[PDB]
Specification:
The structure is cut from a larger assembly and holds three copies of chain A. By secondary structure, chain A is α+β, with helices and mostly antiparallel strands. Chain A is built from 17 helices and 25 strands. The radius of gyration of chain A is 27 Å and the shape is globular. Chains in contact: A-B, A-C, B-C. Bound molecules: adenosine monophosphate (2 copies). Chain A: Homotetramer.
Chain lengths: 593, 590, 102
């Protein structure tokens, strides 16, 4: 009588079915972050595990977030508006005054320009999904809808009329109207698709760093009892130094028991709605330096160095940050190292590395008339706001720039021009910003023992180049003198012209590498790094360690996602359970019909 | 200037991304009653708002189609038991544990019924929706709420709960071919008690008639200056096949006897807190359903010396010329005029009362008086099932068509019994024992709506023969006069079948299985109205209704428990949004 | 204010459980339910209190049991006898006027 066996099969069958209707169900979801930078617009495709629980709705497991594809670098959002202003306002718009009111006639023409770009991003996104997902995964991803987060960093923020915000209204209309033939349910809203500031970018990069490295989590790393008797809990978070194209961000946890001066403030991630209340309280020093971006620092450096009598003689600017044998036209225009060995300087106003700073330093537009010191800071850098744009960016009494390959002079000038200028640029007081004005002020008044991660392609190139030539050891841990001695050797290299093109030839027959558009001025980045490390060493509190990272390894050893602001943007929406459930699932793609 | 066209274009696009968006949703209510299972298709307007999710506008709930009557859920279980337990399962002890060997066979029975219901639901959606409505309806998902009422309540083993697990599984796997995303969960698809049916019917009535809303009709200030607000709700009298429900608002400024309780809709999680407090008198009587009252009426009338003489039971609620064999078995009026009484234990009208009034049932074991209340109503729990339902010393039931004698027997057997059947005590009920007690001790001024197929057929029959005026508004003597005349009709056999021939040659109608015992319903109506009239407080008005017309005069939905079941879910905004939209049909992926 | 026999039983049950250190914010055991939600309870002791006018019997409802629909579990949080921070307490509460000493 194996009747008992077949009774239990029936009992277990019913239990299996009961468990299935009472337990949580997992489903895969795709998430898209469109990185709309200054000179490019690129799609970023993510996957996440959603959990659907009886009477609780649907949520994302934040630890499941993973990048499955980075797309093609298309034209920057700036290009859409520049071309629209070239056709309808006249190619003369960058110099001549334009009545913005008249441009409302060309709204569907602006819509068409943005449509071209959005179709290309949509095409590229669909391509990445189709190539990375199996048929089962595609069924889950197509049914759930695909939230889209388009965020413009730099480039677009520089227009100062109605165009910018109107463009955003148009991009969202295009995102919410995808072609039905592919079946991917792309959608957005004004909370997910919007421009972000340099300061907000830093906070997102801080969140990304801390999530990927698993330092950020609901469970506190350490708790402490305050003066009143209430338990105060925190995570052991790492700080971040992110050097981008248009700005550099420095975001790190506020030192425990530190009281900042009244004029500056710790940015509280819970108060700013970047982290939910269920996460340990996070108070950070947040700083975004507009003159410390790869592009903006290059422009300002030339403007200031080449207006200094020690460096400028008879129309020749002797640049200590450029290699011996290198020469270029005297301007902050975009440099192309030609196979010939020579340098081509793009003289277009649109391609000038000083353009963001020179538009910021004008009589016609901002803070210049407001605070006397603001106009005083522009004139100091030989950019008088009363002059037209071309004249403001022009390096006067200067014809050529010759490299002298003197690292110590390069460090001294980076210190004097970019890191500790006599008159800092106005302090930014937005919610995302602590309100600091210089690097010294940060490390003099608000230094911390939290570890620091150095990020940005240019920063990592500076270190890796020295390691590649065996000037820096692979175990390099951030010692200043070690870096300075390594860079002093590399930076004294000669530009040699060979049949295969120009080369950076190292002293004492150490070797060579090809000279190119990306590496010709990298000694300025090595000098910036030396200067940052010195200011960090001079702090009362020292970071427990300093590391240079491009990626953070995951549980399997493979990076789950890349460093930057993208992960942080997903998290600040996704971690707010109720609001995310309402927007992504209740409203969803069905909100578009 | 073409600039204003551009400025308007951006402002309209901006409004489009800041404003709420409306979208249509279909909702399904499967009514799994004792004799039948029928789908009910509804339409609703959803509103999607930035940072606020998606909700249903309750005023938009509209019935678009009520489908076919398929077999009762009870048939699934009876057939599976006849096969796997044996033909004598209703009368012999069964080892329920051995039946765990036949779970796929139970699933197989449920699957045939679910496929028929699914196909019918889809046919209704396809016949009522335009191509644009279909797009919206298909996108949002289709919540399904299967609720069983009578029929499955009395099995008392693991079977019913197991059947429900299988039904939700079937609902959660619809045919992908039609594009309709049907889905359910254990909160939507579940059995409901008779007292719960009453509360949902009371909610349906008050919602459709626009009495139930967030804004109160009247308030009273308490000792602490706090407003104690209420709506002006109507009560309901619902006579179904298996039970009769009475639900009405508790008379204002009153407190019930301490041994009974007012049912609070907000406390019972039926209405959200944003709705004024609704305290109700809630009553469900198994013995007052069409099928059960018919069985018990015969059981008690045919055991009384005044009616039973020489093996002949003289029934005053039956027509002169009508005759049937002595049993509470289902009556089939045959073409030849004769009555065919089904002797099957399964077809006995007394079977649900016999199941309640059994030693097996723990319900009669909790309370000591319960067994006595059963026995004194001629349903002896000590007797075996067949003996328990049998009418002794009786061969024939003869109709006498005496309406007043019928009313007086309805009073003594059904409305005001000397000793009622055990009172129903559950979270959804007040604990009253009889109709007489309801109106003697807890009468209200609230208007009353009389509903149910049989109740309305009884009023319509008298109106169609022009015995009652069309504008009849509930007068007891007008009703008793019309019913008295109709109930004195003679049953005549004709070549075309049996007819009810009205006196003074004032008409005729076909005699059938559905209308032969209709005079008992008329007597129940007179008896109920007499009790409501004698109350300290009388309803402001009394109406017989089947549906409530919308603001456009067009029919909005039907009266009954279905709309109320939808509301007790949709009105809890956050819970609804999570269940219908966040989890949705996508919860069934893989 | 006056209190009834049934309220007196609930009050006596709370007294006993507080004094014996059974009632408190710290649950004695927490059970992961069918949905995967941990449901915390104190290990409460029942009371038989025989007074002059009535006898009260109050004890926690058996874990995973379904009472007949004709009777109900008294929830202390719902009756505002215990705050929300205290683990949920469902009791069988009875007061018999005929079991008192007098
Ligand atoms: N290998 C590299 N050498 C020099 N500059 C780079 C390199 N990779 C990226 N950059 C620059 O560093 C900045 C940040 O780059 P990324 O971290 O790749 O977004 C931009 O101005 C890039 O053009
Ligand atoms: N036209 C009718 N004539 C007589 N009895 C009816 C009629 N319609 C329904 N009934 C009875 O009323 C009960 C409830 O019907 P309903 O409201 O349609 O569920 C049924 O179970 C039948 O016993």
């Amino acid at each position: 009588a194996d009747t008992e066996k077949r009774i239990n099969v029936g009992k277990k069958h019913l239990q299996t079915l009961r468990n299935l209707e009472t337990r949580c169900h997992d489903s895969l979801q795709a998430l898209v972050v469109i990185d709309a930078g200054s000179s490019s617009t690129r799609t970023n495709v993510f996957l996440a595990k959603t959990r659907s629980c009886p009477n609780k709705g649907r949520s994302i497991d934040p630890d499941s977030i993973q990048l499955i594809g980075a797309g093609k670098r298309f034209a920057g959002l700036r290009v859409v508006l520049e071309e629209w202003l070239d056709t309808y306002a006249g190619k003369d718009w960058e110099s001549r005054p334009v009545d913005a009111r008249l441009l409302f006639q060309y709204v569907p023409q602006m819509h068409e320009g943005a449509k071209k770009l959005m179709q290309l991003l949509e095409e590229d996104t669909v391509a990445i999904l189709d190539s990375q997902l199996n048929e089962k995964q595609k069924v889950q991803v197509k049914a759930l809808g695909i939230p889209v987060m388009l965020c413009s960093t730099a480039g677009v923020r520089d227009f100062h009329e109605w165009y910018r915000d109107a463009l955003f209204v148009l991009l969202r209309h295009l995102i919410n109207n995808p072609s039905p033939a592919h079946g991917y349910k792309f959608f957005t809203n004004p909370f997910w698709t919007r421009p972000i500031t340099g300061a907000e970018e830093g906070l997102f990069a801080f969140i990304t760093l801390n999530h990927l490295s698993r330092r950020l989590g609901e469970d506190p790393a350490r708790c402490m009892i305050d003066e009143y008797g209430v338990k105060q809990c925190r995570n052991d978070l790492a700080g971040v130094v992110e050097v981008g194209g248009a700005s550099a961000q420095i975001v790190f946890p506020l030192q425990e028991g530190t009281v900042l001066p009244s004029s500056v403030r710790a940015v509280n991630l819970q108060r700013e709605r970047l982290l939910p209340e269920r996460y340990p309280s996070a108070d950070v020093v947040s700083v975004s330096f507009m003159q410390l971006g790869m592009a903006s620092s290059a422009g300002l450096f030339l403007k200031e160095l080449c207006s200094n009598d020690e460096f400028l003689q008879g129309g020749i600017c002797s640049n200590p940050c450029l290699f011996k044998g290198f020469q270029q036209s005297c301007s902050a225009g975009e440099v192309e190292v030609r196979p010939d060995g020579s340098a081509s300087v793009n003289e277009d106003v649109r391609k000038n590395r000083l353009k963001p700073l020179a538009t910021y330093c004008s009589v016609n537009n901002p803070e210049i008339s407001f605070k006397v010191t603001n106009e005083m800071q522009c004139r100091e850098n030989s950019i008088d706001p009363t002059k037209p744009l071309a004249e403001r960016m022009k390096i006067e009494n200067c014809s050529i720039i010759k490299g002298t390959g003197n690292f110590d002079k390069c460090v001294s000038q980076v210190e004097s021009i970019l890191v500790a200028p006599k008159l800092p640029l106005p302090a930014n007081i937005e919610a995302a910003s602590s309100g600091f004005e210089s690097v010294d002020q940060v490390f003099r008044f608000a230094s911390s023992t939290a570890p620091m991660i150095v990020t940005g392609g240019g920063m990592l190139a500076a270190i890796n180049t020295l390691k590649d030539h065996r000037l820096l050891r692979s175990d390099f841990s951030g010692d200043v003198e070690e870096l300075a001695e390594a860079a002093r050797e590399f930076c004294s290299s000669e530009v040699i012209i060979r049949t295969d093109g120009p080369v950076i030839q190292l002293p004492n027959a150490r070797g060579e590498q090809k000279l190119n558009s990306l590496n010709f001025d990298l000694c300025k980045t090595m000098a910036l790094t030396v200067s940052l490390l010195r200011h960090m060493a001079a702090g009362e509190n020292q970071p427990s360690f300093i590391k240079w990272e491009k990626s953070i390894a995951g549980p399997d050893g493979k990076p789950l996602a890349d460093l930057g602001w993208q992960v942080g943007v997903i998290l600040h929406h996704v971690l707010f359970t109720e609001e995310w459930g309402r927007n992504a699932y209740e409203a969803g793609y069905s909100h578009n019909l």
